[PDB]
Amino acid sequence: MEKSFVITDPRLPDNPIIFASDGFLELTEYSREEILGRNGRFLQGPETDQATVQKIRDAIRDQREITVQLINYTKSGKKFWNLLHLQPMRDQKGELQYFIGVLLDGEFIPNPLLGL
Ligand SMILES: Cc1cc2nc3c(=O)[nH]c(=O)nc-3n(C[C@H](O)[C@H](O)[C@H](O)COP(=O)(O)O)c2cc1C
Ligand SMILES: [Cl-]
Ligand SMILES: [Co+2]
Ligand SMILES: [Mg+2]
């Protein structure tokens, strides 16, 4: 694929990544073998706003779509702003099946306005 995204399986413990796009490998510098089976939180680090992490936790609990902008880190420790779009995916039976997270790299909203 082209875009940077991961798919998780919420029917398995702690919502592991079951698919990572080529774009996600390139953006994050991790190999597919380093990503499969782990939770999306591994990209976080010291500067990640815990208030934003709570917003994500609530959206996944409530199975609601959300977009947030938060600091994430590549494998080599480079900070990037991640505009992260999380969408629940339901099957034809109305049952949660996946989450997809699409990442866009950039400080789209300036930190001084994000922090207000
Ligand atoms: C499909 C999906 C993709 C995610 N991608 C990211 C990501 O790129 N960066 C990130 O910081 N968190 C990401 N997360 C969020 C974490 O996995 C986690 O839900 C969040 O940190 C809140 O839960 P926690 O407080 O248990 O860590 C993703 C979550 C899901 C479901
Ligand atoms: Cl999660
Ligand atoms: Co591109
Ligand atoms: Mg945490």
Q: Where are the domains of the chain?
A: 4-114
Distance 107 CA to ligand 2 centre (A): 23
Residue 7 pairs with which residues in a beta bridge?
19, 100
Ligand 1 atom closest to the CA of 14, numbered from 1: 26
Method: X-ray
Question: What is the DSSP secondary structure assignment for residue 94, as one 8-state letter?
Answer: S
Residue 80 pairs with which residues in a beta bridge?
72
Q: Which CATH class is domain 4-114?
A: alpha beta
Question: What is the DSSP secondary structure assignment for residue 101, as one 8-state letter?
Answer: E
Residue with tokens 């680090």: 45
Task: Yes or no: say if 97 and 90 are a contact pair by the CB < 8 Å rule.
Answer: yes
Smallest CA-to-CA distance from 71 within 48, 53, 40 is with 48
Ligand 1 atom closest to the CA of 100, numbered from 1: 1
Task: Yes or no: say if 105 and 81 are a contact pair by the CB < 8 Å rule.
Answer: yes
Q: How far is CA 93 from the centre of its chain?
A: 25
- Does the beta carbon of 44 sit less than 6 angstroms from any atom of ligand 1? yes
Helix (H) and strand (E) counts in the chain:
4, 5
Q: Which one of the ligands is nearest to 57 CA? A: 1
Sort residue 16 into left (φ over 0), alpha (ψ -120 to 50) or beta: beta
For this entry, resolution in Å reads 1.4
Smallest CA-to-CA distance from 66 within 51, 53, 84 is with 84
